Ligand binder design. Structure first.
Ligand code: ATP
Ligand code: ADP
Ligand code: MG
Lengths: 142, 40, 40, 209, 51, 52, 378, 53
């Protein structure tokens, strides 16, 4: 496979064996960031907001045809707002955890940078890893 | 296999040792003491 | 600040060497965290 | 062959000519922060079964900061004098070695010595030498430091709540830091060192005079 | 010396590391005795307050 | 009213009088109210030890 | 709904085993039985009960309403899977398969519960399902199934502290360890009596208090009794509401031996009446007697036998046949003299009796691996 | 508050000198321990019985 480690003899550089599987550049990224993984069972009294966010995120994966029953395009963008310390991060983490999507937040940091590219002159280079883990959700702070 | 011819035809053990010493020794101690208050 | 109180309430029972968190440690904590609310 | 562990970054604070003569009474007017770091470091080192028994998740590492000359080095001197555990005291701008690899190995063998040695205490000063914010993958003088932060960022995650290894880190400017270092599970406790007031100030006058 | 920066060029990074190594090497964890430092400038304005 | 600091004095005085007149749980209650009141004053300079 | 559910089985005991006692239990057991949809658990309780000839419409109206709840589950599943939540079929029967757990038997419970266990990715519902399995395994005394979900529970008590799911669990280990005759573990699981709560199964907290004192008075020695249960305010104020039990404990600690028999026949008599004690009341007081004999008799060496009748409890020949049956039972370390009328004691070293249990366990495990060695290799 | 704790303190120190004078021997008469404590005999017999209990 491309991007895989090997064993290699040294005198003629003949290919020897095939070791492990290294590590996906995204797993390293989320390991660096360490979002506080969450669930529905640690939600305090936000149930109508849960009913809102299910309609935008939960439904257009489990039933993409259900919007084609209404002939309307699926939503793509979510804005959450409120004071800090109000469950934004655990909510957005939790919804991706229960719908099984790759929760990827961006911070614009430069420790992240080496797993995106050598320079990654755009932000758009993230989309290779995004469509490589295609059922995924992108998160942002303020 | 197991031919075995016919010449003839916890929950259970601590209670069984209570039955070993105590199979039938006064059963319901409730009034023998009060029958020995006046004799003893 | 709810978690800021409820995490802190064990420090009171710990600093008096308890092993069971009591209800007065919580009101002992609300007067500290809401004092931090009173700070600026 | 397998080896008994080794590190050169520091031995172990050789304990004879190593404890800076500094009493707790030498610090006047720090009743909040002295008792607070007493809660933070050595009280889980001794009374671990209360933190386990009530289960209040004792802190892994602690950060302390503020304006310079507020006793940042001094408190580490006094705690280092009155500790019973082993103590590892490194100078935080020495991981920038000329050769590659000596940096990252110099990172990991310190925590290997804290692992093997004792329920000990790690002290790091001038973290601004390592934990910056911006990076530039065109020098190597920056890529090295990037790897230096990735090593200890892995290694602090490589704990299991059972080892009693505490990390004390003191800096001057909290602004030039990555909050990825300040994520919970790695750092939770933050201690500013506010300028002396007129109340703690007199106490310092009494102690020094 | 320098004051500090909000991290402009890549060159000033390790010079700040050099400076902080000097700062810790002055009065961190040492009986700094019998060793006296004499310094001089034409402007004492571009300096670290920690220095 | 506006005051906070004199409440510490009257609750601590209740902590004197209920144990001095032998009502232990009410004295623990008033002592507890003196604790959770006395947490919120920036300067109990002598009332700290007086409560201690 | 399993939260009031233990009183039902306790009243099945109270109906069945005291044979004279067969009127009010079949009154109130019927009161809870032919309402709240209970259908399965009383056909052989009806065998132990009378004919109750016209139960047929009573069956049909309740399996009819059971059919209504069943068919509205069957109305729930397709709109549940149609627009999907968190697999809302098993989100429905993770609430209503417990209704089917009470109402139906354990099978419609268990395949729906091992079914629904794979849904809730957080333990906050998983461990409650495990609690339900603990309770129904307690009901049918599924002594192997409790050993499974005890450990399977405990595997989920690590992550988090969850002391309302750990101290809550210690109640279950205490009730099973007092179901079996494991008393020194039972009071040890009954250590806290603080985090223990106004529960569903001992709706009187004080009934739990009576249980932990009844097991503790065997399970611990004097040093502990003279610190723990005597100085606990939280244990003291609830037996302060008890006239008999406060007397029953303090008669032993305060060396009041004659009234200790009087209260002892009361506690033993109620324990004889008691469900989930009734397997071992005959083991309880035969230990209480020899323990009380140890407490008084290990003070003196030259105590006569004719002092114990008036000073301890009446009946000289009863003390004769009692004590003997205990020296003869290999405990109660003394050696009674007869024709000069004195009781003499000794002190045994902890070298022969400590040896004795080792030859017991050694011969037992030798029988064990002896047997398995016969089992393998044909 | 002093008068509250003098009884329990009296029990503690009673047992402290009590185990002090029981030390040196193998066996003794209780009249000698009542004399050497300078105390009665029934209270000493009951209290020593509480010790061995
Ligand atoms: N009780 C006290 N509280 C605060 N400062 C004190 C006290 N006693 C002495 N000092 C002075 O404060 C200084 C604290 O030294 P320390 O090196 O800890 O400062 P710092 O906060 O680490 O600042 P920097 O990081 O720039 O060294 C000492 O040089 C000492 O002269
Ligand atoms: N409803 C809630 N239930 C439980 N915890 C909450 C709730 N709201 C906020 N928190 C706490 O707030 C913190 C997360 O804040 P959040 O709002 O997710 O991000 P931000 O504050 O940066 O917007 C967590 O530590 C969490 O425990
Ligand atoms: Mg310093």
């Amino acid at each position: 496979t491309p991007n895989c480690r090997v064993a290699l003899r040294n005198d003629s550089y003949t290919l020897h064996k095939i070791l492990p599987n290294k590590v996906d550049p995204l797993v390293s990224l989320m390991m660096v960031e360490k979002v506080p993984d969450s669930t529905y069972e640690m939600i305090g009294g936000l149930d109508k907001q849960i009913k809102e966010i299910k309609e935008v995120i939960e439904l257009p994966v489990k039933h993409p045809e259900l919007f084609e029953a209404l002939g309307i395009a699926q939503p793509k963008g979510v804005l959450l707002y409120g004071p800090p310390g109000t469950g934004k991060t655990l909510l957005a983490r939790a919804v991706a955890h229960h719908t099984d999507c790759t929760f990827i937040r961006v911070s614009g940091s430069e420790l992240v940078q080496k797993f995106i590219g050598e320079g990654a002159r755009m932000v758009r280079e993230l989309f290779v890893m995004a469509r490589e883990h295609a059922p995924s959700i992108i998160f942002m702070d303020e | 296999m197991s031919e075995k011819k016919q010449p003839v035809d916890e929950d259970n053990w601590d209670d069984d040792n209570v039955e070993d010493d105590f199979s039938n020794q006064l059963r319901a101690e409730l009034e023998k003491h009060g029958y020995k208050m006046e004799t003893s | 600040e709810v978690k800021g109180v409820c995490t802190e309430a064990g420090m009171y029972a710990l600093r008096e060497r308890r092993v069971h968190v009591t209800q007065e440690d919580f009101e002992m904590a609300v007067a500290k965290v809401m004092q931090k609310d009173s700070e600026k | 062959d397998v080896l008994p562990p080794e590190a050169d970054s520091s031995i172990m604070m050789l304990t004879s000519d190593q404890k800076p003569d500094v009493m707790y009474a030498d610090i006047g007017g720090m009743d909040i922060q002295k008792q607070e770091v007493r809660e933070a470091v050595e009280l889980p080192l001794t009374h671990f079964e209360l933190y386990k028994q009530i289960g209040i998740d004792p802190p892994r590492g602690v950060l302390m900061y503020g304006p310079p000359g507020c006793g940042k080095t001094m408190l580490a001197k006094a705690v280092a004098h009155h500790t019973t555990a082993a103590f590892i005291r490194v100078v935080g701008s020495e991981f920038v070695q000329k050769y590659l690899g000596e940096g990252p190995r110099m990172v990991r063998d310190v925590f290997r010595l804290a692992k093997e040695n004792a329920p000990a205490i790690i002290f790091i000063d001038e973290i601004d030498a390592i934990a910056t914010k911006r990076f530039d993958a065109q020098t190597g003088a920056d890529r090295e430091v990037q790897r230096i932060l990735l090593e200890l960022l892995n290694q602090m995650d490589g704990f299991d709540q059972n080892v009693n290894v505490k990390v004390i880190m003191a800096t001057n400017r909290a602004d030039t830091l990555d909050p990825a270092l300040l994520r919970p599970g790695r750092l939770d406790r933050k201690i500013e060192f506010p300028l002396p007031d007129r109340r703690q100030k007199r106490l310092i006058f009494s102690t020094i005079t | 010396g320098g004051r500090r920066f909000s991290e402009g060029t890549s060159a000033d990074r390790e010079i700040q590391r050099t400076l902080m190594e000097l700062l810790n090497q002055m009065d961190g964890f040492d009986t700094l005795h019998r060793v006296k430092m004499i310094m001089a400038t034409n402007r004492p304005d571009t300096l670290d307050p920690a220095l | 009213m506006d005051d906070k600091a004199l409440l510490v004095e009257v609750q601590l005085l209740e902590s004197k009088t209920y144990h001095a007149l032998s009502n232990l749980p009410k004295a623990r209650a008033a002592l507890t109210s003196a604790r959770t009141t006395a947490n919120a004053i920036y300067c109990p300079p002598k009332l700290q030890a007086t409560l201690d | 709904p399993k939260n009031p559910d233990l009183r039902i089985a306790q009243l099945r005991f109270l109906l069945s085993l005291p044979e004279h006692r067969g009127d009010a239990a079949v009154r109130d057991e019927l009161m809870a039985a032919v309402r709240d949809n209970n259908m399965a658990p009383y056909y052989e309780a009806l065998c132990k009960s009378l004919d109750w000839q016209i139960d047929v419409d009573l069956l049909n109206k309740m399996k009819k309403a059971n059919e209504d709840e069943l068919k509205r589950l069957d109305e729930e599943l397709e709109d549940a899977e149609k627009n999907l939540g968190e697999s809302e079929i098993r989100d429905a029967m993770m609430a209503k398969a417990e209704y089917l757990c009470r109402i139906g038997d354990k099978e419609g419970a268990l395949t729906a519960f091992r079914k629904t266990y794979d849904k809730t990715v957080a333990l906050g519902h998983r461990l409650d399902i495990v609690f339900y399995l603990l309770r129904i395994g307690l009901f049918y005394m599924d002594n192997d199934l409790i050993t499974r979900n005890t450990e399977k529970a405990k595997s989920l008590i690590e992550e988090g502290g969850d002391w309302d799911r750990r101290n809550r669990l210690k109640v279950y280990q205490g009730l099973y360890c007092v179901a079996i005759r494991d008393f020194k573990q039972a009071a040890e699981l009954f250590l806290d009596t603080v985090s223990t709560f106004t529960s569903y199964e001992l709706m009187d907290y004080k009934t739990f208090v009576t249980y932990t004192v009844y097991v503790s008075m065997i399970a611990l020695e004097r040093p502990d009794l003279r610190e723990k249960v005597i100085k606990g305010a939280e244990i003291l104020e609830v037996l302060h509401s008890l006239p008999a039990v406060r007397q029953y404990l303090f008669s032993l600690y305060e060396c009041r031996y004659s009234v200790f028999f009087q209260s002892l026949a009361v506690v033993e008599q109620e324990m004889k009446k008691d469900w989930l004690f009734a397997p071992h009341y005959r083991y309880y007081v035969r230990e209480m007697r020899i323990h009380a004999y140890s407490q008084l008799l290990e003070s003196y060496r030259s105590l006569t036998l004719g002092y114990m009748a008036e000073a301890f409890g009446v009946g000289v020949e009863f003390i004769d046949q009692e004590l003997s049956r205990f020296i003869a039972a290999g405990r109660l370390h003394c050696k009674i003299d007869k024709v000069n009328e004195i009781v003499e004691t000794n002190r045994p070293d902890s070298k022969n009796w400590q040896y004795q249990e080792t030859i017991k366990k050694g011969d037992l495990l030798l029988n064990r691996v002896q047997k398995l060695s016969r089992v393998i290799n044909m | 508050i002093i008068s509250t704790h003098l009884a329990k303190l009296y029990d503690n120190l009673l047992e402290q000198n009590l185990i002090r004078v029981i030390e040196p021997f193998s066996r003794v008469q209780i009249e000698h321990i009542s004399s050497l404590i300078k105390l009665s005999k029934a209270d000493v017999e009951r209290k020593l019985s509480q010790m061995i209990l």
